[PDB]
Structure 1
């Protein structure tokens, strides 16, 4: 029952010391369970899904776009870029950049995707094109994770992001080849084992994208294919009052467990 789940989520938030935002879409009956579902949260690297999806949308009309080489230059390097730094003064294809951004949260890769879309305004324009009026990307990858309270830059709501993730992976926002590619990348994520995945049965298939940033911001957005029932879309956003708070992936796992046990 939704109220029971929301009460548990409220208990989770209270014990966590932070602010918790949850949106669950159960596609079996299109019920939605929200907790702070219309509050804005910093997206951090969960925004990489929109950027990958927008480049996939570009490739629907620019054939072979994903195989185009992109130069990685020293000026592209930033703090966290475990794939792209191995290609400085070389190239990576836009497919490789998308995979690196999604599966390793590589921030140089994300910056190349943002640039390929015409800047943060271009990523935001893609969101608007697919009916997301809430998402806003305002900054490039080495600064969009500051997650300062009160700062509307690089934020969305749980409800908006769950609706958009559903449209991208289970709906028709992308062509079929592109949708399959996005889902393949998300299923291959390497950074999510402690977040939503840790609160779910291992026999369920998950595609997800984590995010983290300042103020102990710890996020995860996921498409879930349980056994025995239709897919779920789950967004879990979490942020804390101290600028130097530690990440709490285990809180997202608890959110996912409450959802997976209660609905």
Structure 2
């Protein structure tokens, strides 16, 4: 059905930006692709691979998720909805992971990066699960420049869709860790206006949004349409002006377009 292709193409043209979509239907492994092999800056969506790297460690290191880290007034970044509540005290890695994933807390992200030894370690983890496109280069907030043509902190919609699938439904993570990642993605509190907005209200969704410079507005999610096989969806969107406004409505439209009737 190229109807979807035409609709996506029109959506992009009308938006005046560059749209990236990758949908994987686990029912038969069919895919809906639109610039699925092009690179897009990930913004907060890179936080999923990051949190997953920590979960991977917990498979061998027992109780690591309960390990504590101190939050100093110096760790605070441009967005600390949760961490700012702990300046002077501690947060476990689980709490930190939850904070970065569900509230997109930047301080929490850098705390996880520090724990992992830097962005290069997240990239290594991605490679270990077969993702040869993903690449994390900087920490928060520099990783959000999203400069057109810059390959730093980018990935493709398809590569991210495959990795999200491997992580949440596949074998990239062990049972317990897989369940925690899914639980965290379902508990996201910032996706209300994105992919979720374009889906029937009773469908169950796990997702991670993101928004940064050049009006880059992203979202990656796993969708369970009632009792049907899960859908893995990545909607990436970026614009020409560095100061462009975010277009969460564009991702919602894209989501409706590709998931309608699934």
Q: Provide the TM-score with structure 2 as the length reference.
A: 0.99
Q: CA deviation at 1:228?
A: 4.0
2:205 corresponds to which residue? Answer: 206
The unaligned stretches of length 5 or more in structure 1 are none
CA distance in 2, matches of 1:116, 1:232: 32
Structure 1 residues 243-252 or 74-83, which shifts more?
A: 74-83
The unaligned stretches of length 5 or more in structure 2 are none
Alignment of 1:28 onto 2:40: no
SS of match in other structure, 1:233: strand
Deviations 1:167-219 (A, max 9, x none): 00000100100000000000000000000000001111000000000000000
SS of match in other structure, 1:10: helix
Q: CA deviation at 1:262?
A: 5.5
2:67 corresponds to which residue? Answer: 68
CA distance in 1, matches of 2:140, 2:205: 25
Structure 1 residues 238-247 or 224-233, which shifts more?
A: 224-233
Q: CA deviation at 1:6?
A: 1.3
Deviations 1:103-138 (A, max 9, x none): 000000010111111100001000001100000000
SS of match in other structure, 2:170: coil
Deviations 1:24-74 (A, max 9, x none): 000000001110000000000000000100000011111010011111122
Q: CA deviation at 1:75?
A: 2.3
Alignment map for 1:81-100 (pairs within 5 Å):
81-100=80-99
Contact 1:5 1:262 in 2 (8 A): no
What is the count of residue pairs matched by the alignment?
262
1:156 corresponds to which residue? Answer: 155
2:3 corresponds to which residue? Answer: 4
Alignment of 1:220 onto 2:223: no
Deviating beyond 2 angstroms after TM superposition, the runs of 4 or more aligned structure 1 residues are none
Structure 1 residues 225-234 or 159-168, which shifts more?
A: 225-234
SS of match in other structure, 2:28: coil
Deviations 1:84-113 (A, max 9, x none): 111111110000000000000000001011
CA distance in 1, matches of 2:14, 2:125: 37
SS of match in other structure, 2:211: strand
SS of match in other structure, 2:208: strand
Q: Provide the TM-score with structure 1 as the length reference.
A: 0.98
CA distance in 2, matches of 1:209, 1:114: 18
1:80 corresponds to which residue? Answer: 79
Q: CA deviation at 1:76?
A: 1.2
Name the Cα RMSD after superposition: 0.8
CA distance in 2, matches of 1:123, 1:240: 27
2:48 corresponds to which residue? Answer: 49
Change in Cα spacing, 1:102 to 1:243, as seen in structure 2 (3 Å) is same
1:234 corresponds to which residue? Answer: 233
